Design a protein around this nucleic acid. Structure first.
Ligand SMILES: [Mg+2]
Ligand SMILES: [Mg+2]
Ligand SMILES: [Mg+2]
Ligand SMILES: [Mg+2]
Ligand SMILES: [Mg+2]
Ligand SMILES: [Mg+2]
Ligand SMILES: [Mg+2]
Ligand SMILES: [Mg+2]
Ligand SMILES: [Mg+2]
Ligand SMILES: [Mg+2]
Ligand SMILES: [Mg+2]
Ligand SMILES: [Mg+2]
Ligand SMILES: [Mg+2]
Ligand SMILES: [Mg+2]
Ligand SMILES: [Mg+2]
Ligand SMILES: [Mg+2]
Ligand SMILES: [Mg+2]
Ligand SMILES: [Mg+2]
Ligand SMILES: [Mg+2]
Ligand SMILES: [Mg+2]
Ligand SMILES: [Mg+2]
Ligand SMILES: [Mg+2]
Ligand SMILES: [Mg+2]
Ligand SMILES: [Mg+2]
Ligand SMILES: [Mg+2]
Ligand SMILES: [Mg+2]
Ligand SMILES: [Mg+2]
Ligand SMILES: [Mg+2]
Ligand SMILES: [Mg+2]
Ligand SMILES: [Mg+2]
Ligand SMILES: [Mg+2]
Ligand SMILES: [Mg+2]
Ligand SMILES: [Mg+2]
Ligand SMILES: [Mg+2]
Ligand SMILES: [Mg+2]
Ligand SMILES: [Mg+2]
Ligand SMILES: [Mg+2]
Lengths: 117, 116, 65, 154
RNA sequence: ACACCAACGGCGAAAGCACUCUGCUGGGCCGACACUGACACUGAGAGACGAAAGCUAGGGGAGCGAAUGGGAUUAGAUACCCCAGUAGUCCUAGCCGUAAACGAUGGAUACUAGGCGCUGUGCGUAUCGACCCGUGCAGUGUUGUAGCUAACGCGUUAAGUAUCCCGCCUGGGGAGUACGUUCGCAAGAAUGAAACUCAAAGGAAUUGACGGGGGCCCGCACAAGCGGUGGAGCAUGUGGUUUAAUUCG
RNA sequence: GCCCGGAUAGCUCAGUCGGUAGAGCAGGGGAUUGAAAAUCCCCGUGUCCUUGGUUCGAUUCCGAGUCCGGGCACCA
C-alpha cells in the first residue's frame, strides 16, 4: 500500500505473547503481526517459535512494500527477545540498529503482590 | 450401603470372627463416609476383622481392623488399627483412610505444579 | 526517544555474532533479571535477601577467581 | 538398563540375497521362532511382487522403507508440571525399526488370503506411497508439526 | 514512590531516616590545659517521643489493595490462582500507645591474648600533596586464647572478673481471662485474680524413623520392545451360602 | 391488511456476475493425560422449500404455490 524505503520494527516481548509491529520514522504504523494472529493460542503463544513465525510474517508484508533498511526495537522480558531477532536476520533485510527499549521505572507505582503458588 | 459407591467393591471378611447385622451396618456407615467423598478414585475396599483376647486367647481384649483401598490409578492404601471394641476399631480405620485418601487426592488432583 | 542497549550492526553482519553481542549487552545491563525483579512487589526483607545473596555472589566470584 | 548400555550385535545377511534388510524383515515377521515358515512366506512375497511388476524387488524394498521411514515423531515429556508432546528426532536404526513395524502391522490387517499376498500387497502399496503404512507415518508428522511449538531444544 | 550509587556502609535515644537544593536546629567524636573543681551513676512515682493497622475533621486519590463481586480449581473452597475493585495507603490538625518495638541481651564504671577488617579524625613518617606506612583515641564487623555456660555458644561491643542503682521471674493449664478502677470518641490499652484441674509443661544436644526438603546411585521399577491376565468355556484354590458334616490350618 | 428478508449437512448460517455445494458445533477415531480437560488432528451425511419457465446446462435468474422470521398501518 505504502512503499517506504526505511523505517522501524517494534518487537514487544511479554511472557504470554510477543507483538511485532512495522512502522516508519515519521512515527506511523504500517502493518503488524502478533504471535496470536498466526493461529497460536495461549501456551504455545509464549514460545520463541511463535515469535519466529510472527517476525517472519510481518517481514513478508514489509518486503512486499519493498523496504530495505530498518531499526529493531525490543521491549520486554519475554523469550522472543532473542528468537524474533534471528527472523529479522534471515528474512534478508538490512539491519541498521537493534535497541532495547524495555521500560525501567526509576521508582514508582508499587507492583502487584507476590503470587503464592 | 450407597448407590454413588455402587462402582466400588466392599468386601467384608471376618477372620477369626462372626459378622453380625450391626457390624455390617456400622461398616457401611463408617467406611461409607470415608470413601463417599473421594468415590471417583476409589475402587475396592477390603476390610478384615481380627479379634483376640478375653476368653479366646491371652492378652487384653483386642479387636483389630485392617482395611485396604485401591484407586483406579494408585494402589496400596493400608490401614491397621487396634482397639477395644469393633466399633472403636472401625472408627479408627475410617479416620486413617480419610487422611490417606485426601493425601492422594491432594498430591495428584491439585494440578499441583511440580516442576522437575 | 530513549534507549538502554545500543547494538550497531555493521555490514560484516552474520546472525550468530549479532545475536551473541546483543545477548551480552542484555547480560551487561541486567535487564531481564530486572523485569523479573519488578514483576512483583518485595518487602524490605526480600530486598535485603537479594542484596546479600547477589552482592556476596559476585563478590565471592571476584575473590575466588 | 540404568547402568550398562548395549553392545552391538552382528548384523546378519539373508542367505539368498545377502541382505541386511531382508534379514531384518524375516526376523520381525517371525512368530514362535519358526524361521522355516518366515523364510517361505517372505520368498513367496518376493515371488508375487516379481509376478505383478517387472521391476527389481531388491529396489522395491528401498522404496518401501524410504517411503514409510519417519524422520521425526513425538514423545511425552513432563516439563514444569505441564504434560507436553515434544517432537524428539529419530535415530536411523529406530527409523528402520518403525518402518518394518508399521509395514508388518498394516500387513497383518489386510483382507487377503495368504501372508505372502498381504506383505506383497503392502510392499507394492508402500513403494508407490499409496497405502496405510505411509499414511501412518504422515500422521506422525502431522502431529509432530502441530506440536512443533513445544520443542525448546529447537 | 525515589532506579544505578547501595556496602558483611552513615546518623539517630528508640521508633526510623536516601532524587536534588537551600534555610532553622539537635547531638557525636577528635586536638589543645583555656577554665569550674565531684557538679557524678541510676531512677519508684511523673513526663516526652513512640512502625503498621485503626479512628475524628477537612482535603486528595494514579498505582496497589482488606472487604465485596464474577471466573475457575475442588467432594466442598466463604482459600491459594485470575478479572475487576470500596475502605485504606498520601497531606493538614489531632487521638490511640501497642509489635519477634529483637542483639529475643537495662544502665554506669573498672579490669582481663590476639588475628583480619571498616568509618571518622590526630600524631609521626612518605613526599613537602594523594597515597604510603607505623601508631593514639572514638565507634563499627568477623574468627578466636583465658574464663564462663545445661549445652548451643559468648568471648574488650562479654553472656568473663568485680561495685552500684532499676525493672522483672518463682510448675502448666484456667488466663494476660473475670471483677473493679484509671485512660480512650470507639476499637481497646494499663493494673491483674480465684475456684477448679493436671504430674507434668518446657530448654539444649543425640541416635533413629519420616519429609508432596536437597545431592549421588542402583534394580524388567518405568521407558523401548515381545507375549499374556481381565472377556469365553472348562480345570483347580479360596471366600460366601448351604448342610448332620461340608475336619483343621 | 401492506412492506421487507429467509427455507442450504443432525443444529447455526457462508454464497461465483450460472459450470465444485460450503463453514462452525453436535457426533465417530487417535493419542493427548498414571486418569480428567485443554491440546490437537482425521472421517460421515445434502432432491440448496414446492412447482413450472429461461438456459448448452441452474442453489444462483424469473413467474405461481407453501411455510417462517420482523417492520408499518386502520373509526363495522
Ligand atoms: Mg504462562
Ligand atoms: Mg551413571
Ligand atoms: Mg550508632
Ligand atoms: Mg524509606
Ligand atoms: Mg549539625
Ligand atoms: Mg581552685
Ligand atoms: Mg518507670
Ligand atoms: Mg503521643
Ligand atoms: Mg497509619
Ligand atoms: Mg471501621
Ligand atoms: Mg478521611
Ligand atoms: Mg481508585
Ligand atoms: Mg488490581
Ligand atoms: Mg468469590
Ligand atoms: Mg457494585
Ligand atoms: Mg464456586
Ligand atoms: Mg485496577
Ligand atoms: Mg497524624
Ligand atoms: Mg509488650
Ligand atoms: Mg524494628
Ligand atoms: Mg592501602
Ligand atoms: Mg573501641
Ligand atoms: Mg557475633
Ligand atoms: Mg566470637
Ligand atoms: Mg547466662
Ligand atoms: Mg508487669
Ligand atoms: Mg498455678
Ligand atoms: Mg469514660
Ligand atoms: Mg477487634
Ligand atoms: Mg505480674
Ligand atoms: Mg529442639
Ligand atoms: Mg532422608
Ligand atoms: Mg530424600
Ligand atoms: Mg516386576
Ligand atoms: Mg514397557
Ligand atoms: Mg476368566
Ligand atoms: Mg489348631
Amino acid at each position: 500500500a505504502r512503499k517506504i524505503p526505511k523505517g522501524v520494527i517494534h518487537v514487544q516481548a511479554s511472557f504470554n505473547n510477543t507483538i511485532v509491529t512495522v512502522t516508519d520514522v515519521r512515527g506511523r504504523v504500517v502493518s503488524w503481526a502478533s504471535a496470536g494472529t498466526c493461529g497460536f493460542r495461549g501456551t504455545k503463544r509464549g514460545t520463541p517459535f511463535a515469535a519466529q513465525t510472527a517476525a517472519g510474517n510481518a517481514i513478508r508484508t514489509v518486503v512486499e512494500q519493498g523496504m530495505q533498511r530498518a531499526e529493531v526495537m525490543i521491549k520486554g522480558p519475554g523469550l522472543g527477545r532473542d528468537a524474533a531477532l534471528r527472523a529479522i536476520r534471515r528474512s534478508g533485510i538490512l539491519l541498521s540498529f537493534v535497541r532495547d527499549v524495555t521500560p525501567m521505572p526509576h521508582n514508582g507505582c508499587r507492583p502487584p503482590k507476590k503470587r503464592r503458588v | 450401603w450407597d448407590g454413588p459407591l455402587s462402582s466400588v467393591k466392599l468386601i467384608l471378611q471376618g477372620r477369626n470372627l462372626e459378622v453380625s447385622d450391626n457390624v455390617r451396618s456400622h461398616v457401611e456407615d463408617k467406611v461409607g463416609k470415608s470413601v463417599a467423598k473421594h468415590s471417583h478414585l476409589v475402587r475396592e475396599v477390603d476390610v478384615r476383622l481380627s479379634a483376640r483376647g478375653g476368653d479366646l486367647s491371652k492378652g487384653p481384649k483386642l479387636r483389630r481392623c485392617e482395611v485396604t483401598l485401591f484407586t483406579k490409578r494408585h494402589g496400596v492404601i493400608r490401614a491397621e488399627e487396634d482397639a477395644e471394641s469393633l466399633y472403636s476399631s472401625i472408627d479408627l480405620v475410617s479416620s486413617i483412610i480419610q487422611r490417606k485418601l485426601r493425601k492422594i487426592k491432594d498430591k495428584v488432583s491439585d494440578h499441583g505444579r511440580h516442576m522437575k | 526517544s530513549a534507549y538502554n542497549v545500543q547494538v550497531l550492526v555493521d555490514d560484516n553482519e552474520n546472525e550468530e555474532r549479532l545475536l551473541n553481542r546483543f545477548r551480552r549487552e542484555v547480560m551487561r545491563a541486567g535487564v531481564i533479571q530486572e523485569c523479573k525483579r519488578r514483576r512483583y512487589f518485595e518487602n524490605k526483607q526480600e530486598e535485603k535477601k537479594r542484596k546479600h545473596r547477589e552482592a556476596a555472589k559476585r563478590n565471592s566470584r571476584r575473590r575466588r577467581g | 538398563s540404568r547402568r550398562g548400555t548395549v553392545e552391538e550385535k552382528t548384523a546378519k545377511s539373508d542367505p539368498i540375497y545377502r541382505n541386511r534388510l531382508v534379514n531384518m524383515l524375516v526376523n520381525r515377521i517371525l512368530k514362535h521362532g519358526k524361521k522355516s515358515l518366515a523364510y517361505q512366506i517372505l520368498y513367496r512375497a518376493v515371488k508375487k511382487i516379481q509376478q505383478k511388476t517387472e521391476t527389481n524387488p531388491l529396489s522395491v524394498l528401498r522404496q518401501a522403507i524410504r517411503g514409510v521411514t519417519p524422520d521425526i515423531a513425538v514423545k511425552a515429556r513432563r516439563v514444569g508440571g505441564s504434560t507436553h508432546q515434544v517432537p524428539i528426532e529419530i535415530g536411523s536404526t529406530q527409523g528402520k525399526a518403525l518402518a518394518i513395524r508399521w509395514l508388518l502391522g498394516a500387513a497383518r490387517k489386510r483382507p487377503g488370503r495368504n501372508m505372502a499376498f498381504k506383505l506383497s500387497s503392502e510392499l507394492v502399496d508402500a513403494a508407490k506411497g499409496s497405502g496405510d503404512a505411509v499414511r501412518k507415518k504422515e500422521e506422525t508428522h502431522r502431529m509432530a508439526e502441530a506440536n512443533r511449538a513445544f520443542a525448546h531444544f529447537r
